[PDB]
């Protein structure tokens, strides 16, 4: 029922914003207990958004829920590393719960969109962050935390590459997602950080490409495509 | 000269990425000193990008530069909050200089795009955060920090509403910007968070509407209608 799809998705999208606002406020103040406990509430809302997208087969709604799961998993690692670095077992377990809640949400999207490689990479990153949480590791969780940020930036470069349809842009977003997940499985903070600056490099090129596509001045497009390829080679080698 | 426009735009975008990486790296380690002084170098990069768009009249490059200036000003409020909350005068002044550098960047975009309402809102937000800096008041700075990120969400909701061309989405992004800036001058974090939540409500339906290019996900249009109604009652 399309009426029921609009009902459940709208009410889950409202609970999504409610939890996002609660987490943003705690992100300012540094209240890690409230922030992690808010990422739990946020991970639930992403989970039921992935569940409604599976029930009604809305593939676009599943992709949105997968993107949100990646953001919750990434934030929960920054809370995880800052908790084990402060010896807070209560906040560490709160963050761990937020990780696995977002992991199950990604696995729900992976059940609806198994042939979506970016959803697989999101699911692998969350399950990889699960391991870093049960590990009580300040170094492995730090590495997957860097790689998580590189994935998030590459995911926005991908969705921005969907617009305008620049294939050199989405090809680059794919390369960064693979090299970030490769650096995450390697658990090397140096490699993941190298993928991070490359993801930033091409995403700024993208914004420069989109400001060069709009209202002419397409000379800013040439060197931003060249900047895109320079940065992709900065990640390859 | 279009050759020099591509030249200086690439040079400034390169130093923008180098400073963006330096800030992200310091944001991981929690080095608020290095993070603040990396937002300084990032604010100068946005200021050079705004200057370039001004001289060459690239309105699109000026709009993106204003967007960046708003981000740097918002990140510097984050740092200012955690600085005055920890009694760090060194980091508080480092954040203050980053706010003023981003404020100047917004002023330069305003010179090139004075008829852009969103550029005026950003310039007022940076000047208003500049006062919360000299005041070193953690409550006023927290309100303008929430209101800042509420402005950011309303700006992407604006940019997405231009693509979709939905006038109800454009009018909605405008009223959220006005209510956020009002909440920022009022310096009350409560209704500032409310405008933030409403901005998220509408923007979720816009991101799903922009991803709904492929199939008939017309239920997303019902997501936007009801989210825009919820945001109208938020006024």
Numbering used by the authors:
A (entry chain C): 0 to 236
B (entry chain A): 0 to 234
What does the paper say about this structure?
We did not succeed in solving the holo-state structure of SP3; however, we were able to solve a 3.05 Å-resolution apo-state structure of the closely related design SP3x, which shares 94% sequence identity with SP3. The SP3x homodimeric design model agrees with the X-ray crystal structure to 1.61 Å Cα r.m.s.d. In the SP3 dimer, the calculated spectrum based on the design model agreed with the experimentally measured signs of the CD Cotton effects, suggesting that the P700-like ZnPPaM dimer in SP3 assembles as designed.
To investigate the photophysics of special pairs independently of the complexities of native photosynthetic proteins, and as a first step toward creating synthetic photosystems for new energy conversion technologies, we designed C2-symmetric proteins that hold two chlorophyll molecules in closely juxtaposed arrangements. For Chl dimer protein scaffolds, we chose hyperstable C2-symmetric repeat protein dimers containing symmetric pockets with tunable sizes and geometries. In this dimeric repeat protein architecture, the hydrophobic core is independent of the small molecule-binding site, enabling full customization for binding with little impact on the overall protein structure. We describe de novo-designed proteins that hold Chl dimers in precisely defined, closely juxtaposed geometries.
